Amino acid sequence: SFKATITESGKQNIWFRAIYVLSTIQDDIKITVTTNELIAWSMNETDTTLCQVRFQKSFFEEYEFKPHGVQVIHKLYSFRVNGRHLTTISRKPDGDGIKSFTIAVNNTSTCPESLANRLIVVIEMDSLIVKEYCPQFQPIKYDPINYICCNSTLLKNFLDNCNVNVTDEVKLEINVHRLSITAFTKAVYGKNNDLLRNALSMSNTISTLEHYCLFKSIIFKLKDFKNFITIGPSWKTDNISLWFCHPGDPILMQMQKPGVKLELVEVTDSNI
Amino acid sequence: EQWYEKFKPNCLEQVAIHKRKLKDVQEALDAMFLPNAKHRILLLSGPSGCSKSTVIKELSKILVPKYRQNHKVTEFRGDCIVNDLPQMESFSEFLKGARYLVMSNLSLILIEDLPNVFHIDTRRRFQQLILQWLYSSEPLLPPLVICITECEIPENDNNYRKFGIDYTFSAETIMNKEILMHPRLKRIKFNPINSTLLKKHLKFICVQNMKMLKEKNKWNKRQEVIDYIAQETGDIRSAITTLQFWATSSGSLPISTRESTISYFHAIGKVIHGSHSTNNDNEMINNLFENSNNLLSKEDFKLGILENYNTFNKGEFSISDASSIVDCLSECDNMNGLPESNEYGLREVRKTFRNISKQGHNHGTVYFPREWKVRKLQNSFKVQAEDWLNVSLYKYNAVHSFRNITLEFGYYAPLIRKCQSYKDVVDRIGGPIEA
Amino acid sequence: SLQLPWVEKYRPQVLSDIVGNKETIDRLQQIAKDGNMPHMIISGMPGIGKTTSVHCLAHELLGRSYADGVLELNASDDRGIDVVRNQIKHFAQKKLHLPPGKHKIVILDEADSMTAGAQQALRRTMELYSNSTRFAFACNQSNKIIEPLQSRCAILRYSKLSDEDVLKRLLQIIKLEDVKYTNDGLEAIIFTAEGDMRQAINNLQSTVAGHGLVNADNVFKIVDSPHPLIVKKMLLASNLEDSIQILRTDLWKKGYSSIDIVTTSFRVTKNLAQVKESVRLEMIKEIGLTHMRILEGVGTYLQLASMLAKIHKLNNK
Amino acid sequence: NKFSASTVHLEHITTALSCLTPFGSKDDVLIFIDADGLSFVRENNHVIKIQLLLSRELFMSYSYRNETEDHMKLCVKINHILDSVSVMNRNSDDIVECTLSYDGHGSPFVLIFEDSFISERVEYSTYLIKDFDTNGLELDRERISFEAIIKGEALHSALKDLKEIGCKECYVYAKTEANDENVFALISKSQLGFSKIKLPSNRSILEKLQVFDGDSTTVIDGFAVIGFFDFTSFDKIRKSTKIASKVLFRMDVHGVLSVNILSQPGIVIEVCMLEKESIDEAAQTEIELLMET
Amino acid sequence: SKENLPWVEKYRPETLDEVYGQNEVITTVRKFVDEGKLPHLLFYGPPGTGKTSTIVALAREIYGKNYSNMVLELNASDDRGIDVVRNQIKDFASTRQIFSKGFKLIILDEADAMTNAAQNALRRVIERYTKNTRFCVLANYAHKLTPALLSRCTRFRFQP
DNA sequence: GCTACGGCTATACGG
DNA sequence: GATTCGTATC
Ligand SMILES: Nc1ncnc2c1ncn2[C@@H]1O[C@H](COP(=O)(O)OP(=O)(O)OP(O)(O)=S)[C@@H](O)[C@H]1O
Ligand SMILES: Nc1ncnc2c1ncn2[C@@H]1O[C@H](COP(=O)(O)OP(=O)(O)OP(O)(O)=S)[C@@H](O)[C@H]1O
Ligand SMILES: Nc1ncnc2c1ncn2[C@@H]1O[C@H](COP(=O)(O)OP(=O)(O)OP(O)(O)=S)[C@@H](O)[C@H]1O
Numbered sequence A: 001s002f003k004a005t006i007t008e009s010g011k012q013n014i015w016f017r018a019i020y021v022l023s024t025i026q027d028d029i030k031i032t033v034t035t036n037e038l039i040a041w042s043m044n045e046t047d048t049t050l051c052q053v054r055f056q057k058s059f060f061e062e063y064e065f066k067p068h069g070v071q072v073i074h075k076l077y078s079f080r081v082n083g084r085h086l087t088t089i090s091r092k093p094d095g096d097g098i099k100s101f102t103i104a105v106n107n108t109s110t111c112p113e114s115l116a117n118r119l120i121v122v123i124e125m126d127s128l129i130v131k132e133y134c135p136q137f138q139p140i141k142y143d144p145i146n147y148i149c150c151n152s153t154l155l156k157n158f159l160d161n162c163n164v165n166v167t168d169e170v171k172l173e174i175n176v177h178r179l180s181i182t183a184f185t186k187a188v189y190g191k192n193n194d195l196l197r198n199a200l201s202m203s204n205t206i207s208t209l210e211h212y213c214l215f216k217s218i219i220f221k222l223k224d225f226k227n228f229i230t231i232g233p234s235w236k237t238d239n240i241s242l243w244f245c246h247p248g249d250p251i252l253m254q255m256q257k258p259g260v261k262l263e264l265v266e267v268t269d270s271n272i
Numbered sequence B: 001e002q003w004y005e006k007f008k009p010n011c012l013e014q015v016a017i018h019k020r021k022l023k024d025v026q027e028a029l030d031a032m033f034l035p036n037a038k039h040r041i042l043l044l045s046g047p048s049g050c051s052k053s054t055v056i057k058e059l060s061k062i063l064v065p066k067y068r069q070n071h072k073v074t075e076f077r078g079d080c081i082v083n084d085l086p087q088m089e090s091f092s093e094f095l096k097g098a099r100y101l102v103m104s105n106l107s108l109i110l111i112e113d114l115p116n117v118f119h120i121d122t123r124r125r126f127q128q129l130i131l132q133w134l135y136s137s138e139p140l141l142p143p144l145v146i147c148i149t150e151c152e153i154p155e156n157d158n159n160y161r162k163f164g165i166d167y168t169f170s171a172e173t174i175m176n177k178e179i180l181m182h183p184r185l186k187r188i189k190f191n192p193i194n195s196t197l198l199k200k201h202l203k204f205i206c207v208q209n210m211k212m213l214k215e216k217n218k219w220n221k222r223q224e225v226i227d228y229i230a231q232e233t234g235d236i237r238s239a240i241t242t243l244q245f246w247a248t249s250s251g252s253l254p255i256s257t258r259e260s261t262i263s264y265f266h267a268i269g270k271v272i273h274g275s276h277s278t279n280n281d282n283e284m285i286n287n288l289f290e291n292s293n294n295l296l297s298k299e300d301f302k303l304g305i306l307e308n309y310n311t312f313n314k315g316e317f318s319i320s321d322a323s324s325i326v327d328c329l330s331e332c333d334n335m336n337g338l339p340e341s342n343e344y345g346l347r348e349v350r351k352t353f354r355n356i357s358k359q360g361h362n363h364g365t366v367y368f369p370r371e372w373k374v375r376k377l378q379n380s381f382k383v384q385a386e387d388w389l390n391v392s393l394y395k396y397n398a399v400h401s402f403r404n405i406t407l408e409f410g411y412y413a414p415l416i417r418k419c420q421s422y423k424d425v426v427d428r429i430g431g432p433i434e435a
Numbered sequence C: 001s002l003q004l005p006w007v008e009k010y011r012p013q014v015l016s017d018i019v020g021n022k023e024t025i026d027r028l029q030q031i032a033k034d035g036n037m038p039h040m041i042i043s044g045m046p047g048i049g050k051t052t053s054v055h056c057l058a059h060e061l062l063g064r065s066y067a068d069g070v071l072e073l074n075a076s077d078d079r080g081i082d083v084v085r086n087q088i089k090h091f092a093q094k095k096l097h098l099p100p101g102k103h104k105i106v107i108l109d110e111a112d113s114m115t116a117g118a119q120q121a122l123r124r125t126m127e128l129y130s131n132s133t134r135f136a137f138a139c140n141q142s143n144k145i146i147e148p149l150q151s152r153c154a155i156l157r158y159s160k161l162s163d164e165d166v167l168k169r170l171l172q173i174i175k176l177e178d179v180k181y182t183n184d185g186l187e188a189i190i191f192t193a194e195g196d197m198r199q200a201i202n203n204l205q206s207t208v209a210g211h212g213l214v215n216a217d218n219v220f221k222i223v224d225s226p227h228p229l230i231v232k233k234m235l236l237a238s239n240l241e242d243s244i245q246i247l248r249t250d251l252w253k254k255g256y257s258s259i260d261i262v263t264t265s266f267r268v269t270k271n272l273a274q275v276k277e278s279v280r281l282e283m284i285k286e287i288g289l290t291h292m293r294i295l296e297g298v299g300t301y302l303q304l305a306s307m308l309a310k311i312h313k314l315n316n317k
Numbered sequence D: 001n002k003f004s005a006s007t008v009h010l011e012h013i014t015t016a017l018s019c020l021t022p023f024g025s026k027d028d029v030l031i032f033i034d035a036d037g038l039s040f041v042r043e044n045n046h047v048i049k050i051q052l053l054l055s056r057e058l059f060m061s062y063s064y065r066n067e068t069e070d071h072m073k074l075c076v077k078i079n080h081i082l083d084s085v086s087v088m089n090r091n092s093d094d095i096v097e098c099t100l101s102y103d104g105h106g107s108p109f110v111l112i113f114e115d116s117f118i119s120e121r122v123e124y125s126t127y128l129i130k131d132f133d134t135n136g137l138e139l140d141r142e143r144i145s146f147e148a149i150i151k152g153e154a155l156h157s158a159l160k161d162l163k164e165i166g167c168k169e170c171y172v173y174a175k176t177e178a179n180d181e182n183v184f185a186l187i188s189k190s191q192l193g194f195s196k197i198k199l200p201s202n203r204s205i206l207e208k209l210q211v212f213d214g215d216s217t218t219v220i221d222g223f224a225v226i227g228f229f230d231f232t233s234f235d236k237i238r239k240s241t242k243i244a245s246k247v248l249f250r251m252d253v254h255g256v257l258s259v260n261i262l263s264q265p266g267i268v269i270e271v272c273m274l275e276k277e278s279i280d281e282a283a284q285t286e287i288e289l290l291m292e293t
Numbered sequence E: 001s002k003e004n005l006p007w008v009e010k011y012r013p014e015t016l017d018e019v020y021g022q023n024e025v026i027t028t029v030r031k032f033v034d035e036g037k038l039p040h041l042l043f044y045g046p047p048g049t050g051k052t053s054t055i056v057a058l059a060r061e062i063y064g065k066n067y068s069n070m071v072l073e074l075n076a077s078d079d080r081g082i083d084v085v086r087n088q089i090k091d092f093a094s095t096r097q098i099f100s101k102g103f104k105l106i107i108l109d110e111a112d113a114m115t116n117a118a119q120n121a122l123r124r125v126i127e128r129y130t131k132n133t134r135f136c137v138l139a140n141y142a143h144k145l146t147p148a149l150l151s152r153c154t155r156f157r158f159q160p
Numbered sequence F: 001g002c003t004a005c006g007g008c009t010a011t012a013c014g015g
Numbered sequence G: 001g002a003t004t005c006g007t008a009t010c
């Protein structure tokens, strides 16, 4: 039915990094096949974060799809695949580059049990070595203010300078004069005012930014923001969009690529 | 599907739970959904198949869509292994994202699949992460419900390093006293399902299978099998599974349910007063050793026998019987924990209490041994004696052995120092001696 | 040199060839013909047909899908918390197109030796994926499986195999192999088996290999009478001079160790009938003191003679 | 001394030692001393054996004055040597001239490291030799079913991919098609599923694949040999293929794979591996279906 | 070389004809070898009765000069824990026998000192690879062996 | 062409 | 298994 092939380098680095991030978010990555795009998404167990990566048909050399599991809305075949398993197939080996990365599923009467509920991914190295994999998949059903347009790299350096174990929450205080974000963690006080957990408040300020349309204070997690931030800077050829409304409302993070759509939704702190 | 999955309750009236227990769970849960609740965590503890989560889910179904500031629970999945996360950090990232499940995103977080607590480091991490939630400074936090099933850990890990978690999977051996005696933690212990509710629910399931029951000529003997299952087990899931297995059968295979483990005080009472099921002490003792060897081998059981054998008739039996019991226990203590030692001590205690047993005996209440209190007072004595020794080393250059301390230094030395001060420790080492 | 032992050569391949426990085997046949297998725990003494029943049920329930629908894990394989969390989870998550009423089977042989954490993760494993795969635990002592796991399973207890099922299977094997026998030889083989099919087949094989004709003399010159039944005879003697005679001739000069005799005496006393409880506890005490003396280094015949003398002294009084 | 060998290219004897560690990290290593060269043989669980050989041409001086016996056998611990030559290698940039020595049975194995200022001398205790003989785990040279010559880099990359995908069990497919096609694959059982790595039929990676009917003489086409191996044993050659220019694969009907690794003179590595029972006979047909797929 | 040995080691039997006292066990194992079908054996008896001398001579008779690569002898002097059973014994039983003498032999001397976890794990290695390997268990105390392991072994008693 | 340092990985150890 | 207090029901 569906068959997609990637035959470029940066096109493969962005795919591998997106798959790695979606595997870090949830154990099983969610992939849906459309006739015009490839939607790979993943949601946390707490249902607080949702990262979705959309690969258009122009991102692949060939994007055959014959739907004639399946769910009509336009037909849509969705399936579940293990993230830790797909992140090693798409891993770029050291010493032998990838020439053609083909991903396909053949759920037809012509297919035997080797292709029944098992995804087909083809890797052809530049050394002509052909590596075959058959990851098992499970059919499923798809489950589908102020504006900030800051530069991704200025965020990138500070975010990489933040450890997830010692810093968990990020504050984003947007002002018309300047925008300062601070990666902080709170302190937990014990029985006799004992320090169960410390408080680190590493911070950085970026002067006001391109499209700081306020038309504030927001708090959300950090372990997925860093990953979604470093997804895009893998296809070297870089502006992130922050759409948040209220403390209790989710924040939307979007990035752009020539053939890749990046979306991240996170639940924000309802504290006012 | 299976009858315990297809005949699951739809509302709270179909849940096999006691009325008072349901009332105490309901009021506590309703109180924990208030803006600033006094209780932060609700620890439900009890045996398996006691509707501990089967009541939490159907209570959340009517509670969460009442306080959601515009419907179900968020359960922790321990088996989830994500790419970039240490295994011990899996619960931390769950509790760090679950705390965002507050107003307009409200969800009761239920922890029934506990993390791996048989490994010490992650058990300690679990404890300190719960303590970081009880002592959290967040103005608003979601209600947290933790269900722990009390089950005896079977005989494994032949190392002598068996800890409490290596003997019994209970809230006492998973949590610590700081969590268990916290002002913001509410514990509601659950009891096994009584015979009446089990009978009523197994009869509702039968009238929902009446056609198939009658076709296999099993509809008049349904009363006896429901009664036998209700009398034999207190597990609703096991009861429904056994009923389904008996109904779908077409032969005379015998009704067999799961096996339950006795309590420590239950085993003590069985040794002392005997069991009503059988009047043969040999059979009862053999079954107790076969099914509960993990408890009859611990020395605290032989200590509990010595602590509670005086409760047979409130202490009104012959001194010869008590002397025989304690002499047998002392002789068993010299057998180096052989399997023949406990099997002789318990048999002798039961034989002694059987002959003197008469009708109308008003027995007493058993208690746990105080050996641990003595062992902690011994450590306090050690600390105070070493304080005496080191404070009596530089002021007056002198060495003295601890054996001489426990005989003449702690009554005489304070009696000299306080008498020299009535005109440097001055108190009796280890506190005064009473009686 | 390529001939298999009769234990493995005549291992049943269908549920109809499994003798003993007629009701349970019939129920397993109903499960095999219907398909809706529930979670089950099979327990019993070793060598009565627990494993060959689960494997035959899985075969008769899957057939051509047995290669991809059965995951057999046992004590010889690593069954830690990680295997349950990864291998068993992926097998349960696997979607296989099986006939109607048919489910995947996870045969966890020797489930009594599994660690507590793996058993606790198995709770979630069966709770999430009960609609696709079913678990078949086989063990020897069912209390070693935690109660939360037993609550989700249908316990099937296999009883000891009687002297008639053993004779039926032995006669089938004899007819298949064409060996010479007589009635008393088969009776002796069954008597030495003590409810064990595997031991009965091994003893018959040894007798046929050694001599060829299965009579009482050739059976008893290579197979020995069960030493619990000799210890019971020695401990139930009336006067001391023949209990000492038994302990010497049938236990000491035959090669049995003193610690073995002492350990067998304890189990015999725990199940001895027609003896008063006061007598039984004193016998247990004497056996325990003798056990301590053997364990401390003194494994002599005099220490066993003294134990029998004390037992007779407590018996006559 | 009955044996003395001197060298300056200690990197050769260091890579030779680094090829032996995969076969256990703390056990006995057998050293065979003859006039042709110095060989180290290591056996693990009687299922796999590795035999490197250091020729006399790798040493300036190779005396071997032993005359009563043609070959000398000594058994020493590998952990003593590895723990020793590690701290010696702290200043390996110095011009070190290793001197191996052995004076016979009962004498220690001497390893002198002289830097023209310091002469470190290490004597290794020799232990009794076990019962197992290393000639048992060798392929029969008249029963070869397939003979594949593969490059070192491609095999190393394939082994590293099998390691990264887990690969609890491994399969080896070798079929020569009638027209011109040669098929060599390394199929793996792992957590992923059923994965296959196909070596190219081009003559730079797969120089020569030749399938016989169990006599190493009758070349036939259309039939494939399949070898079921445990990747625990199959991964022991991964550290040896890292310095391999060409690798020779040979297997007989008895289920023994003889991996021949030649490095560039240089060290000659011979690894012999045993094949599993494959008691289940459906994976064979599924392998055939997968390769035809 | 053999004259500088203690008499208890110098006069160790090398063939089955030099083992005296145990006539019924030898006359059974010899027929077992002659037919070529050797079951899983269990040797029990007092110390110094000839169990090890019997099993080593039997393996030499079956395997001849291939005793080195065809017999895995593990005793109390080597670690025999759960990992040893799950790795060394299992890969010795699973691999092929280079078509030398048909079946492999694993001799577990002094198996009474073996932990219960290892003896329980060995039960599914004894009955799974029985087509290519056979297990012999030598013990002096049968109370330290699990009942299942005793069940899957043919017991031969070595009399004084 | 060469080197140092960060990331990946195998292994001994804590409880 | 024992005692004591508290219900629910026939
Ligand atoms: N009338 C009923 N009342 C309660 N549970 C029922 C009833 N009918 C069916 N069940 C099922 O019985 C099971 C009882 O589950 P719970 O007791 O809530 O879980 P649990 O107490 O944690 O038991 P463990 O420890 O997980 S085995 C559930 O699967 C219910 O769906
Ligand atoms: N009812 C039976 N009918 C025929 N053969 C049987 C029967 N029960 C056991 N056997 C034989 O016993 C041998 C193996 O039996 P198993 O089922 O593996 O033993 P088991 O009952 O599983 O005990 P454990 O706990 O696994 S050692 C084979 O040779 C079978 O032929
Ligand atoms: N039947 C026999 N015939 C001749 N020599 C024997 C016989 N039995 C024992 N021996 C001698 O006794 C020595 C020790 O016997 P082994 O067979 O090695 O040990 P064992 O008899 O199995 O007792 P354990 O259980 O190992 S202490 C042998 O090396 C022989 O020299």
Ligand SMILES: [Mg+2]
Binding pocket: B053, B054, B112
């Ligand atoms: Mg539950």
Ligand SMILES: [Mg+2]
Binding pocket: C050, C051, C052, C109
């Ligand atoms: Mg079995």
Ligand SMILES: [Mg+2]
Binding pocket: E051, E052, E109, E138
């Ligand atoms: Mg011996």
